[PDB]
Amino acid sequence: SHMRILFLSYAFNSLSARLYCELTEREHEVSVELDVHPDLTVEAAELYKPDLIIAPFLKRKIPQEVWKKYKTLIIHPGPPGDRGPNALDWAIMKGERIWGVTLLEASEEYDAGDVWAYRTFPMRFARKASIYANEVTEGVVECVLEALENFERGDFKPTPQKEHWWNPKMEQELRRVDWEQDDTKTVLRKVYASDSQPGASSKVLGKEVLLFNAYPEEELKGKPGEVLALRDEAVCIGTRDGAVWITHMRERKKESIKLPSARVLGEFLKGVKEDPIKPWEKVDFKTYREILYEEEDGIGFIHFNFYNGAMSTEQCYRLLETIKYAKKRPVKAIVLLGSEDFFSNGMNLNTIENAESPADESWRNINAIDDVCEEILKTPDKLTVAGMQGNAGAGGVFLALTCDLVFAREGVVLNPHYKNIGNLYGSEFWTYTLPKRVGWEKGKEVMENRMPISSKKAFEIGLIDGVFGKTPKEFRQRLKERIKNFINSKDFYEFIEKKKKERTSGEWLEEIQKCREHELEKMKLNFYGFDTSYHIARYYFVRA
Ligand SMILES: CC(C)(COP(=O)(O)OP(=O)(O)OC[C@H]1O[C@@H](n2cnc3c(N)ncnc32)[C@H](O)[C@@H]1OP(=O)(O)O)[C@@H](O)C(=O)NCCC(=O)NCCS
């Protein structure tokens, strides 16, 4: 029943984290070993002595020694028979309508072992990272549990492969976006297949770039490869039959990092102008909308789609303005939805790394995100709800904790800690927000744990107020009908009664102001003190 499971992964990536939660919270024992030289590999399997080895995420062969002695199951983001190291890249380039994930045995030939479990699913037209993080991740969880059942039963035999194919590593020539020859659909497919790594190569404004995060543009028209407009640092680029937005780019050099396009293109954008669209405007054609505000049934819904959940200083202020617009609206509740792939991951570490002074940009970013939290907290006459459709970590978790209610989809993974970014003290009113939910003893325990927890475990400990839904869309529906019932009851007014009283009294405003002050002083030491752990850890996070 209580198996001992050793993870071999290249990195402790999102799928490895999700599996870790699913098995850990089922009373199993999981050791994670980030694949090293095959020697530490053999030696660590010796020392740890597992019942079962999972490889959620490998980029090299497991030593024949190890898996001939321990049952070794490999995750493959393809249907049974699909072999190769870029399964999803190829599935998307080839326009596959149906795809799947396979759990197969380790063997001497790459991806040729017998199958222990698989799932199939209809393929969305979407970024690779998002297929991986939703359909692939969910399927892999089902496979592993099934294999765990088949294993503890001891009497299971895997299905040898039959029909099978090999797709080699994909070269950049196949990904290259050629603006004069490629229609919008072809550019979406190329960028989708390279998002978020390695990027689709291209030439923009004479500069050689990698493209990331593409959105079709249905209104603006021009010459293929022309930069039509700017919009919140994205650029709109003419294609063969229309236009496409690209929010993020990377120079094709070694030391450079993904940044907003306007920061990569920089001074080359002299001519082009901004083409704004408020989050509350209504628009009939497909365009790029970073933040979206929509009112349904007396509720204000704020969508914000910050690439990779990273919140730049500037994006914090765009969000704060949409919150201020909502608080002046005929709505009883205000729901922050993030995006379908992330709720939030706190400060944009890439825009911090890129700034002249990362400490100063770190100072701007933490104050801006604190200004968002403060605005949420000081909403005495309205209900506020955090809706975690996707994962969240570091400052993004505590952004959500400032809302009256925090709901999350099933499968959401949380990292309520700064153990990966140099032990930042954190802010976002966590000294107020966190103990009001779990007490100072547990809250500090939460922040000391570098391992993730599911939205399920977070609910159990009282960190959040409810988990439900299997998909983003389901979660959205159930969340709406749950908030809908509450503001249509006498409980809603008896709740604003208390909240109006406390959150306008001077003893509360000064309480929370002393919290923001105490946190920023610790964070100021983190950004400028002698101990440079935070800057060291940011450097490696951003260049991996
Ligand atoms: C939260 C976290 C544990 C999730 O782990 P995970 O499931 O393995 O997800 P990943 O790190 O692989 O995220 C995928 C992408 O999102 C990016 N990303 C996530 N959070 C980011 C952030 N705050 N800033 C910039 N980029 C971020 C990652 O760089 C990664 O980039 P890539 O796809 O180009 O390789 C992890 O992403 C993390 O440590 N983020 C940093 C958050 C932070 O410290 N913010 C500053 C304090 S508020």
Residue numbers in the entry: -1 to 542
The authors write:
There are many basic amino acid residues around the windows and inside of the cavity, which make a “basic patch”, some of which are involved in hydrogen bonding interactions with CoA. We prepared and determined the crystal structures of variants in which mutations were introduced at amino acid residues interacting with CoA to elucidate physiological roles of these residues.
The putative catalytic residues, His74, Asp80, and Asp109 in the N-terminal domain and Ty416 and Glu426 in the C-terminal domain, are perfectly conserved among HypX homologs listed in the previous report. CO produced by HypX is used as a ligand of the iron in the NiFe(CN)2(CO) center of NiFe hydrogenases.
